[PDB]
Amino acid sequence: MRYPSDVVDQVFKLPPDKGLLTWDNDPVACSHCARPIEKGDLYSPSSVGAFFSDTRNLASTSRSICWRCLILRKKQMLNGLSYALITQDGVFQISKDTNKAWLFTTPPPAPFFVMHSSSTMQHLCWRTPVTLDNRLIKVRYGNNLFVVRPEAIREALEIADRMNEGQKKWQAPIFLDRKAADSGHGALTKAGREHLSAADQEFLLNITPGERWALAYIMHSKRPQPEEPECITSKILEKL
Amino acid sequence: MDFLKVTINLGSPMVEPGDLFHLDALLGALRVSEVRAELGDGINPRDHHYDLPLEQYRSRSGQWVFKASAFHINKGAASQNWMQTSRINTAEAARHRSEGFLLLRAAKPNPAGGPFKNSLYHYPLVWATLTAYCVGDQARIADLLSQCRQIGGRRGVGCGRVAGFSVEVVPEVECTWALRAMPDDSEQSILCGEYALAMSALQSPYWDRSLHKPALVPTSLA
Amino acid sequence: MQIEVLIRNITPIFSAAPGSYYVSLDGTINPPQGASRFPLTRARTMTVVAETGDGVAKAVPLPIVPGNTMRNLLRRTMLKDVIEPALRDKSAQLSIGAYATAYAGNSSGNPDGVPSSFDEIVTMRAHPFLGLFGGGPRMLQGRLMVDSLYPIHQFSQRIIGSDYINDSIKGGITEIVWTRRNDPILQLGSPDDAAVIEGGAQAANDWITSLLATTKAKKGKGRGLKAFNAHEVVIAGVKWLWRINVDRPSESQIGLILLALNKLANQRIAGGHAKDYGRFVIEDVILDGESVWTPSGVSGQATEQFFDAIAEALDGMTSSEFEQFAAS
DNA sequence: ACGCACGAAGACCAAGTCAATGCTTAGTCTAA
Ligand SMILES: [Zn+2]
């Protein structure tokens, strides 16, 4: 895939809705997924309504929405893709911690989109940049766009295991929060501050926010075993 | 035309950039500020943000980037997760609704969404010395950076004040300008370290998603 | 244009820090499991590097007021003291989109995302109020860049500077205030007290019996009114420095900022409305290195032009400008 | 008579943390 809207016609294969206008002016980017809207394509003027609180993430002021985004803005699409991973084969659910560990330790090779919501249901279909290479995974968490490097996650897990190797009571070296909301998120704990070497402390302080978020779901006393997430595109298509 | 190292010292913590913070983008922003002060706010910003004292690298396919590496982030302290909210005072809005200042017929506010939504967001704050490498004019770059006061982002709330800056000529062997978003078909010999393929813009502005292209992004800098 | 406001808080300033933090009776933050723990709401502390105890660099927390809080306080002061009375004098009425844009810069009025022509940008960014605080569906870049309220402390020397060294405080400036909530039913003492209650003695008896049963069940393994806890505040009397910069300000915008600074003393800082926290008095206002704060507020021969410009702007201000800015 | 009000609803996994700062010892005379 190339664009967030490309997930529709490639893994959902949903035909465009009826009654959509046809573009007849100089091409302009979509207001959601930044896809160009060329002459002869199907679009619709923006009618997001007063309850749309994602104006800051709009690609442009074209006020035009391509049919793929019009599909992606349906309630069944927003709810189904709350904790989704959209790859070529299908849409997978990464809600469970084991799924997150598998994704951030053994990512799929193909381009994919990573979905995650910080509340009941949020606009995430059209805000996630594509992950071209598995070594640089871009994850959209609520209003935060994260960059996760699997090698950094593996190195941090190795550091935590080596620091907790001797002590019988397991204790995390770095303070992390699943919601990425705590005031101490990403800061070293007392055990990390006074039981780790200078190189390990410098590495743990110099990780990206996305890596902290991922370790908040992976790094624990009993590391979850990675497992393949289930196929979810069937459920979303049936509910639509 | 000359090889440079740009060092920026902070007097206040800055927002830790989620993606690469590029020297050329900052220079373009400062140039746009200069042309705004000289002409006004009616200018097109895209007509003046390439007039920078930096020489360009052009690849086989014509894709070109500034020779200005992304800023290196070395943290003098652990990153602090800063919390900010947003809310409209409900009692004040109710008073205005009663007095006719506000034309709202709805009975209740909705903190979950709508005009009276309460929102919670976070961004990290870091104390760092900003060092980056570029090829250009020392005098003009130093002049442009003289008017720069804040670094990174969230400047409206005063994040990332500049205590000072320094521009020095350094040997080429120290560190190259390549630590940035290079075009897809860039030559391997000029790349410093491992380069992962990802989607990013090659010219400022870097937040414009319509300008995003597949590019080689340094793994040891993102 | 640099504005330096020297603020001394008469009452303690309480900006609640997110998180569930505990404290013991003796005052130990996060006491161990051995002793009793009570919830604590600490003040907003920012990790800063400083030369503490003759050290080269120490990351010590500094109790501050967030810059976004100061920005919103300035916006509310302008709205409630100059903008709203001026619009009321014209009997102006604002829609929900315009009002949301004016009071929080919320794009809910027109979340479609509206393009802005260069002439429109020039006209609107020159607005006396909406130009300073960008936002709305258009969502411009505001000309106002307000810094956080850093206290004049030993650890804030590298953030504030050495210009106000005479007012610095060496020791800690945080204190713990304990609160308590009592069940009013348990404080009844005579049938005259229970006369106002419809159930009289029977209702109070049932209330007390329910409380006792709930307490016994909780001890063995619905929450009552009784509660004991504390919240941490910055001690009163500490001086603060507020730095405000306006990028390319017009005369009207500077006049509005000066008017807000004149009326800023009537407002509160951060939270604590119930306990009258955050009360402060302006001590000095500095405009581009020139002191302007007279005992009768911001005045002088060098600021009459700003006041005249803002008065003229208020005379001709209409709600149509707000509607156009909010694309309503 | 399109615009706005207002409930129902649909995603639904789920840990480990919560200090960040202590530090010593007597010469000057050159304005009333
Ligand atoms: Zn689209």
mmCIF file of N, CA, C and O in Angstrom, chain B residues 10-13 36-37 40-44 76-77 80 82-85 88 92-93 95-96 99-104 114-116 121 127 149-150 155-158 161, chain C residues 2 18 44-49 64 68 71 80 84 87-88 92-96 99-100 103-104 106 108 118 122 125 141 143-147 150 158-159 243 245 248:
data_model
loop_
_atom_site.group_PDB
_atom_site.id
_atom_site.type_symbol
_atom_site.label_atom_id
_atom_site.label_comp_id
_atom_site.label_asym_id
_atom_site.label_seq_id
_atom_site.Cartn_x
_atom_site.Cartn_y
_atom_site.Cartn_z
ATOM 1 N N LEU B 10 20.223 25.378 25.153
ATOM 2 C CA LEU B 10 18.864 25.682 25.581
ATOM 3 C C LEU B 10 18.861 26.346 26.950
ATOM 4 O O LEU B 10 19.576 25.912 27.859
ATOM 5 N N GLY B 11 18.055 27.398 27.091
ATOM 6 C CA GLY B 11 17.756 27.967 28.388
ATOM 7 C C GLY B 11 16.488 27.457 29.028
ATOM 8 O O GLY B 11 16.267 27.689 30.219
ATOM 9 N N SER B 12 15.645 26.776 28.257
ATOM 10 C CA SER B 12 14.422 26.145 28.727
ATOM 11 C C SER B 12 14.288 24.796 28.038
ATOM 12 O O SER B 12 14.823 24.605 26.940
ATOM 13 N N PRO B 13 13.604 23.840 28.663
ATOM 14 C CA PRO B 13 13.424 22.535 28.017
ATOM 15 C C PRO B 13 12.576 22.662 26.765
ATOM 16 O O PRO B 13 11.628 23.448 26.713
ATOM 17 N N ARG B 36 9.003 37.763 6.354
ATOM 18 C CA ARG B 36 7.760 38.272 6.921
ATOM 19 C C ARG B 36 7.973 39.645 7.539
ATOM 20 O O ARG B 36 7.184 40.569 7.315
ATOM 21 N N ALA B 37 9.037 39.795 8.329
ATOM 22 C CA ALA B 37 9.320 41.090 8.935
ATOM 23 C C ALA B 37 9.648 42.137 7.881
ATOM 24 O O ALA B 37 9.424 43.331 8.102
ATOM 25 N N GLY B 40 5.778 41.464 5.304
ATOM 26 C CA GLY B 40 4.479 41.316 5.929
ATOM 27 C C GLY B 40 4.020 39.869 5.943
ATOM 28 O O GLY B 40 4.751 38.943 5.580
ATOM 29 N N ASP B 41 2.775 39.684 6.377
ATOM 30 C CA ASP B 41 2.186 38.359 6.523
ATOM 31 C C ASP B 41 1.443 37.887 5.280
ATOM 32 O O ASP B 41 0.925 36.766 5.277
ATOM 33 N N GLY B 42 1.368 38.704 4.235
ATOM 34 C CA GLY B 42 0.701 38.290 3.019
ATOM 35 C C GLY B 42 1.538 37.479 2.062
ATOM 36 O O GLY B 42 1.044 37.070 1.008
ATOM 37 N N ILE B 43 2.799 37.225 2.409
ATOM 38 C CA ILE B 43 3.694 36.509 1.512
ATOM 39 C C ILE B 43 3.291 35.043 1.420
ATOM 40 O O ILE B 43 2.598 34.495 2.285
ATOM 41 N N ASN B 44 3.730 34.403 0.346
ATOM 42 C CA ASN B 44 3.649 32.955 0.255
ATOM 43 C C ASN B 44 4.888 32.349 0.902
ATOM 44 O O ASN B 44 6.003 32.593 0.426
ATOM 45 N N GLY B 76 20.685 16.174 28.642
ATOM 46 C CA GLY B 76 21.275 16.453 29.936
ATOM 47 C C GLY B 76 20.461 15.970 31.113
ATOM 48 O O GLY B 76 20.946 16.008 32.247
ATOM 49 N N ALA B 77 19.234 15.524 30.865
ATOM 50 C CA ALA B 77 18.374 14.977 31.903
ATOM 51 C C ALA B 77 17.353 14.063 31.244
ATOM 52 O O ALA B 77 17.156 14.101 30.027
ATOM 53 N N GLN B 80 10.904 14.391 30.372
ATOM 54 C CA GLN B 80 9.754 14.611 31.238
ATOM 55 C C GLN B 80 8.484 14.661 30.404
ATOM 56 O O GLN B 80 8.388 15.449 29.457
ATOM 57 N N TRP B 82 5.183 15.939 29.698
ATOM 58 C CA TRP B 82 4.453 17.142 30.068
ATOM 59 C C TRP B 82 2.981 16.985 29.723
ATOM 60 O O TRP B 82 2.637 16.534 28.626
ATOM 61 N N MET B 83 2.120 17.359 30.660
ATOM 62 C CA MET B 83 0.681 17.215 30.504
ATOM 63 C C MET B 83 0.020 18.570 30.302
ATOM 64 O O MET B 83 0.299 19.524 31.035
ATOM 65 N N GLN B 84 -0.845 18.650 29.297
ATOM 66 C CA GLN B 84 -1.638 19.837 29.032
ATOM 67 C C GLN B 84 -3.053 19.404 28.685
ATOM 68 O O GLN B 84 -3.267 18.311 28.159
ATOM 69 N N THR B 85 -4.017 20.263 28.996
ATOM 70 C CA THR B 85 -5.426 19.989 28.754
ATOM 71 C C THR B 85 -6.051 21.086 27.906
ATOM 72 O O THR B 85 -5.380 22.005 27.430
ATOM 73 N N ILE B 88 -13.414 24.427 27.919
ATOM 74 C CA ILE B 88 -14.168 25.669 27.988
ATOM 75 C C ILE B 88 -14.894 25.695 29.322
ATOM 76 O O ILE B 88 -15.560 24.720 29.691
ATOM 77 N N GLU B 92 -19.044 29.631 32.888
ATOM 78 C CA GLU B 92 -18.939 30.871 32.129
ATOM 79 C C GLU B 92 -19.767 30.797 30.850
ATOM 80 O O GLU B 92 -20.474 31.752 30.495
ATOM 81 N N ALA B 93 -19.702 29.658 30.156
ATOM 82 C CA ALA B 93 -20.504 29.470 28.953
ATOM 83 C C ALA B 93 -21.989 29.456 29.278
ATOM 84 O O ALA B 93 -22.799 29.973 28.505
ATOM 85 N N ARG B 95 -23.417 31.104 31.740
ATOM 86 C CA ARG B 95 -23.799 32.492 31.973
ATOM 87 C C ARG B 95 -23.981 33.232 30.656
ATOM 88 O O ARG B 95 -24.961 33.963 30.475
ATOM 89 N N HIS B 96 -23.047 33.049 29.719
ATOM 90 C CA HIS B 96 -23.171 33.721 28.429
ATOM 91 C C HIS B 96 -24.402 33.244 27.673
ATOM 92 O O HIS B 96 -25.087 34.041 27.023
ATOM 93 N N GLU B 99 -27.334 35.067 29.028
ATOM 94 C CA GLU B 99 -27.347 36.493 28.723
ATOM 95 C C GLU B 99 -27.392 36.789 27.230
ATOM 96 O O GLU B 99 -27.369 37.962 26.846
ATOM 97 N N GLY B 100 -27.447 35.767 26.383
ATOM 98 C CA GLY B 100 -27.532 35.976 24.953
ATOM 99 C C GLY B 100 -26.217 36.215 24.253
ATOM 100 O O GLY B 100 -26.213 36.434 23.037
ATOM 101 N N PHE B 101 -25.097 36.180 24.976
ATOM 102 C CA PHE B 101 -23.799 36.309 24.326
ATOM 103 C C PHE B 101 -23.512 35.104 23.444
ATOM 104 O O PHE B 101 -22.908 35.236 22.372
ATOM 105 N N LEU B 102 -23.936 33.925 23.880
ATOM 106 C CA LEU B 102 -23.763 32.684 23.145
ATOM 107 C C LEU B 102 -25.108 32.242 22.588
ATOM 108 O O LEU B 102 -26.105 32.218 23.315
ATOM 109 N N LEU B 103 -25.137 31.907 21.301
ATOM 110 C CA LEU B 103 -26.326 31.333 20.675
ATOM 111 C C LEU B 103 -26.175 29.820 20.662
ATOM 112 O O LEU B 103 -25.821 29.213 19.649
ATOM 113 N N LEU B 104 -26.474 29.202 21.795
ATOM 114 C CA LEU B 104 -26.504 27.756 21.890
ATOM 115 C C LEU B 104 -27.860 27.324 22.429
ATOM 116 O O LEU B 104 -28.277 27.766 23.503
ATOM 117 N N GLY B 114 -17.245 17.527 20.943
ATOM 118 C CA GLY B 114 -18.043 18.675 20.597
ATOM 119 C C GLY B 114 -17.398 19.967 21.050
ATOM 120 O O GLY B 114 -16.211 20.011 21.379
ATOM 121 N N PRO B 115 -18.176 21.051 21.067
ATOM 122 C CA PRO B 115 -17.597 22.356 21.426
ATOM 123 C C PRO B 115 -16.997 22.397 22.816
ATOM 124 O O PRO B 115 -15.988 23.080 23.025
ATOM 125 N N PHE B 116 -17.581 21.684 23.777
ATOM 126 C CA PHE B 116 -17.128 21.713 25.159
ATOM 127 C C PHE B 116 -16.366 20.451 25.547
ATOM 128 O O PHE B 116 -16.467 19.992 26.688
ATOM 129 N N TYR B 121 -3.695 15.596 26.548
ATOM 130 C CA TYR B 121 -2.604 15.221 25.661
ATOM 131 C C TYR B 121 -1.276 15.432 26.370
ATOM 132 O O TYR B 121 -1.180 16.178 27.346
ATOM 133 N N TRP B 127 15.990 18.514 28.303
ATOM 134 C CA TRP B 127 17.126 19.424 28.284
ATOM 135 C C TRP B 127 18.217 18.821 27.406
ATOM 136 O O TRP B 127 18.727 17.735 27.702
ATOM 137 N N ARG B 149 14.840 32.240 18.543
ATOM 138 C CA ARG B 149 14.710 32.247 19.991
ATOM 139 C C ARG B 149 14.257 30.929 20.588
ATOM 140 O O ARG B 149 14.643 30.629 21.722
ATOM 141 N N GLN B 150 13.477 30.131 19.867
ATOM 142 C CA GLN B 150 12.933 28.903 20.420
ATOM 143 C C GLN B 150 13.145 27.765 19.436
ATOM 144 O O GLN B 150 13.249 27.969 18.225
ATOM 145 N N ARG B 155 6.039 26.324 20.841
ATOM 146 C CA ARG B 155 6.649 27.614 21.123
ATOM 147 C C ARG B 155 5.663 28.616 21.702
ATOM 148 O O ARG B 155 6.087 29.560 22.373
ATOM 149 N N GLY B 156 4.364 28.429 21.465
ATOM 150 C CA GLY B 156 3.382 29.336 22.030
ATOM 151 C C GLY B 156 3.366 29.321 23.544
ATOM 152 O O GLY B 156 3.094 30.343 24.178
ATOM 153 N N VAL B 157 3.658 28.173 24.144
ATOM 154 C CA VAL B 157 3.729 28.052 25.590
ATOM 155 C C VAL B 157 5.168 28.190 26.089
ATOM 156 O O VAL B 157 5.449 27.914 27.253
ATOM 157 N N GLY B 158 6.083 28.618 25.223
ATOM 158 C CA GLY B 158 7.451 28.874 25.628
ATOM 159 C C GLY B 158 8.261 27.634 25.939
ATOM 160 O O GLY B 158 8.708 27.451 27.074
ATOM 161 N N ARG B 161 13.650 27.632 24.762
ATOM 162 C CA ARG B 161 14.351 28.894 24.580
ATOM 163 C C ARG B 161 15.826 28.646 24.298
ATOM 164 O O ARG B 161 16.417 27.667 24.760
ATOM 165 N N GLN C 2 9.085 42.159 24.075
ATOM 166 C CA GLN C 2 9.250 41.382 25.295
ATOM 167 C C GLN C 2 8.508 42.052 26.441
ATOM 168 O O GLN C 2 8.662 43.255 26.668
ATOM 169 N N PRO C 18 -0.751 15.801 37.676
ATOM 170 C CA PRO C 18 -1.434 14.529 37.425
ATOM 171 C C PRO C 18 -0.764 13.383 38.165
ATOM 172 O O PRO C 18 0.455 13.354 38.343
ATOM 173 N N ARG C 44 2.634 21.328 40.423
ATOM 174 C CA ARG C 44 3.228 21.068 39.116
ATOM 175 C C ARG C 44 4.721 21.351 39.168
ATOM 176 O O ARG C 44 5.139 22.509 39.260
ATOM 177 N N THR C 45 5.527 20.299 39.099
ATOM 178 C CA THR C 45 6.975 20.408 39.174
ATOM 179 C C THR C 45 7.591 20.012 37.841
ATOM 180 O O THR C 45 7.201 19.007 37.240
ATOM 181 N N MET C 46 8.555 20.802 37.385
ATOM 182 C CA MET C 46 9.270 20.536 36.145
ATOM 183 C C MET C 46 10.714 20.188 36.469
ATOM 184 O O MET C 46 11.369 20.899 37.238
ATOM 185 N N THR C 47 11.207 19.101 35.884
ATOM 186 C CA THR C 47 12.593 18.704 36.086
ATOM 187 C C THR C 47 13.515 19.680 35.369
ATOM 188 O O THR C 47 13.439 19.833 34.146
ATOM 189 N N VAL C 48 14.382 20.346 36.128
ATOM 190 C CA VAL C 48 15.338 21.295 35.574
ATOM 191 C C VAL C 48 16.725 20.952 36.091
ATOM 192 O O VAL C 48 16.884 20.380 37.173
ATOM 193 N N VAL C 49 17.731 21.298 35.304
ATOM 194 C CA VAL C 49 19.123 21.114 35.691
ATOM 195 C C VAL C 49 19.608 22.379 36.382
ATOM 196 O O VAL C 49 19.315 23.497 35.942
ATOM 197 N N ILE C 64 6.437 24.952 39.217
ATOM 198 C CA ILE C 64 6.100 26.020 38.287
ATOM 199 C C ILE C 64 4.611 25.963 37.981
ATOM 200 O O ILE C 64 3.903 25.035 38.373
ATOM 201 N N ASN C 68 0.734 26.831 29.394
ATOM 202 C CA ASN C 68 -0.603 26.788 28.814
ATOM 203 C C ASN C 68 -1.633 27.364 29.776
ATOM 204 O O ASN C 68 -2.579 28.039 29.354
ATOM 205 N N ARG C 71 -1.335 31.076 29.481
ATOM 206 C CA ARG C 71 -1.941 31.516 28.230
ATOM 207 C C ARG C 71 -3.457 31.570 28.348
ATOM 208 O O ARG C 71 -4.095 32.553 27.947
ATOM 209 N N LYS C 80 -13.105 38.253 29.547
ATOM 210 C CA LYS C 80 -14.012 38.637 30.616
ATOM 211 C C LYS C 80 -13.855 40.081 31.064
ATOM 212 O O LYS C 80 -14.699 40.560 31.830
ATOM 213 N N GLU C 84 -15.503 40.923 26.119
ATOM 214 C CA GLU C 84 -16.925 40.670 26.343
ATOM 215 C C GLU C 84 -17.706 41.932 26.679
ATOM 216 O O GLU C 84 -18.808 42.105 26.132
ATOM 217 N N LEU C 87 -18.195 43.792 23.357
ATOM 218 C CA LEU C 87 -19.191 43.177 22.483
ATOM 219 C C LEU C 87 -20.599 43.332 23.047
ATOM 220 O O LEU C 87 -21.565 43.469 22.287
ATOM 221 N N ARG C 88 -20.740 43.297 24.372
ATOM 222 C CA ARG C 88 -22.051 43.499 24.978
ATOM 223 C C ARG C 88 -22.546 44.921 24.762
ATOM 224 O O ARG C 88 -23.746 45.142 24.566
ATOM 225 N N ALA C 92 -23.745 42.498 20.778
ATOM 226 C CA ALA C 92 -23.296 41.464 19.863
ATOM 227 C C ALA C 92 -23.615 40.080 20.411
ATOM 228 O O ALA C 92 -23.605 39.849 21.623
ATOM 229 N N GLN C 93 -23.904 39.156 19.501
ATOM 230 C CA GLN C 93 -24.191 37.773 19.846
ATOM 231 C C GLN C 93 -23.326 36.858 18.995
ATOM 232 O O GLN C 93 -23.171 37.081 17.791
ATOM 233 N N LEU C 94 -22.769 35.829 19.622
ATOM 234 C CA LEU C 94 -21.854 34.911 18.964
ATOM 235 C C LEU C 94 -22.478 33.528 18.858
ATOM 236 O O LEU C 94 -23.136 33.060 19.791
ATOM 237 N N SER C 95 -22.262 32.877 17.720
ATOM 238 C CA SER C 95 -22.690 31.499 17.559
ATOM 239 C C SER C 95 -21.785 30.579 18.374
ATOM 240 O O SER C 95 -20.836 31.012 19.031
ATOM 241 N N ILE C 96 -22.091 29.282 18.334
ATOM 242 C CA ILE C 96 -21.303 28.323 19.100
ATOM 243 C C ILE C 96 -19.900 28.190 18.520
ATOM 244 O O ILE C 96 -18.921 28.057 19.264
ATOM 245 N N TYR C 99 -17.908 31.397 19.462
ATOM 246 C CA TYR C 99 -17.619 31.430 20.891
ATOM 247 C C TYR C 99 -16.571 30.394 21.270
ATOM 248 O O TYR C 99 -15.669 30.677 22.069
ATOM 249 N N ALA C 100 -16.685 29.180 20.729
ATOM 250 C CA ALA C 100 -15.681 28.163 21.013
ATOM 251 C C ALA C 100 -14.311 28.604 20.522
ATOM 252 O O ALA C 100 -13.312 28.448 21.233
ATOM 253 N N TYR C 103 -12.975 31.361 22.939
ATOM 254 C CA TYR C 103 -12.669 31.042 24.326
ATOM 255 C C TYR C 103 -11.695 29.882 24.489
ATOM 256 O O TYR C 103 -11.026 29.798 25.522
ATOM 257 N N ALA C 104 -11.599 28.973 23.517
ATOM 258 C CA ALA C 104 -10.575 27.938 23.581
ATOM 259 C C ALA C 104 -9.908 27.675 22.236
ATOM 260 O O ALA C 104 -9.054 26.785 22.154
ATOM 261 N N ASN C 106 -11.291 26.301 19.667
ATOM 262 C CA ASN C 106 -11.739 24.973 19.280
ATOM 263 C C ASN C 106 -12.371 25.029 17.896
ATOM 264 O O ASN C 106 -13.221 25.883 17.626
ATOM 265 N N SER C 108 -14.488 23.169 16.527
ATOM 266 C CA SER C 108 -15.730 22.418 16.423
ATOM 267 C C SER C 108 -16.779 23.144 15.597
ATOM 268 O O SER C 108 -17.702 22.500 15.090
ATOM 269 N N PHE C 118 -4.578 35.060 1.375
ATOM 270 C CA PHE C 118 -3.514 35.884 1.938
ATOM 271 C C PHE C 118 -4.060 37.198 2.483
ATOM 272 O O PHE C 118 -3.638 37.659 3.550
ATOM 273 N N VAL C 122 -3.906 38.401 6.345
ATOM 274 C CA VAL C 122 -3.390 39.710 6.737
ATOM 275 C C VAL C 122 -4.403 40.444 7.604
ATOM 276 O O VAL C 122 -4.059 41.026 8.639
ATOM 277 N N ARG C 125 -4.966 38.157 11.176
ATOM 278 C CA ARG C 125 -3.838 38.139 12.096
ATOM 279 C C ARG C 125 -3.577 39.512 12.696
ATOM 280 O O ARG C 125 -2.851 39.616 13.690
ATOM 281 N N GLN C 141 -1.381 30.729 13.185
ATOM 282 C CA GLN C 141 -0.290 30.783 14.152
ATOM 283 C C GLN C 141 -0.444 32.070 14.953
ATOM 284 O O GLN C 141 -0.352 33.169 14.398
ATOM 285 N N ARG C 143 0.272 35.201 17.450
ATOM 286 C CA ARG C 143 1.423 36.070 17.651
ATOM 287 C C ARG C 143 1.903 36.091 19.093
ATOM 288 O O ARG C 143 2.904 36.755 19.382
ATOM 289 N N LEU C 144 1.234 35.384 19.994
ATOM 290 C CA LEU C 144 1.556 35.413 21.413
ATOM 291 C C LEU C 144 2.344 34.167 21.789
ATOM 292 O O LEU C 144 1.956 33.050 21.434
ATOM 293 N N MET C 145 3.450 34.364 22.507
ATOM 294 C CA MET C 145 4.301 33.274 22.982
ATOM 295 C C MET C 145 4.612 33.540 24.451
ATOM 296 O O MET C 145 5.605 34.199 24.773
ATOM 297 N N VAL C 146 3.768 33.019 25.337
ATOM 298 C CA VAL C 146 3.870 33.268 26.771
ATOM 299 C C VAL C 146 4.625 32.119 27.421
ATOM 300 O O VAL C 146 4.367 30.945 27.129
ATOM 301 N N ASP C 147 5.570 32.456 28.290
ATOM 302 C CA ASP C 147 6.359 31.458 28.989
ATOM 303 C C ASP C 147 5.654 31.019 30.268
ATOM 304 O O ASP C 147 4.696 31.641 30.731
ATOM 305 N N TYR C 150 7.808 30.692 36.007
ATOM 306 C CA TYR C 150 8.923 30.141 36.766
ATOM 307 C C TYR C 150 9.137 30.957 38.034
ATOM 308 O O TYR C 150 9.259 32.183 37.960
ATOM 309 N N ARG C 158 19.220 29.551 35.660
ATOM 310 C CA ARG C 158 19.532 29.364 34.250
ATOM 311 C C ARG C 158 18.304 29.444 33.354
ATOM 312 O O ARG C 158 18.443 29.336 32.132
ATOM 313 N N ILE C 159 17.116 29.622 33.925
ATOM 314 C CA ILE C 159 15.901 29.831 33.157
ATOM 315 C C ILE C 159 15.429 31.276 33.238
ATOM 316 O O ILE C 159 15.025 31.859 32.230
ATOM 317 N N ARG C 243 7.274 35.858 31.476
ATOM 318 C CA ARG C 243 7.850 36.415 30.260
ATOM 319 C C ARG C 243 6.858 36.235 29.122
ATOM 320 O O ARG C 243 6.456 35.107 28.820
ATOM 321 N N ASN C 245 6.135 37.341 25.037
ATOM 322 C CA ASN C 245 6.640 37.908 23.797
ATOM 323 C C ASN C 245 5.525 37.885 22.767
ATOM 324 O O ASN C 245 4.815 36.885 22.644
ATOM 325 N N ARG C 248 5.743 40.328 16.024
ATOM 326 C CA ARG C 248 5.215 41.335 15.111
ATOM 327 C C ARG C 248 3.884 41.909 15.602
ATOM 328 O O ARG C 248 2.860 41.786 14.919
#
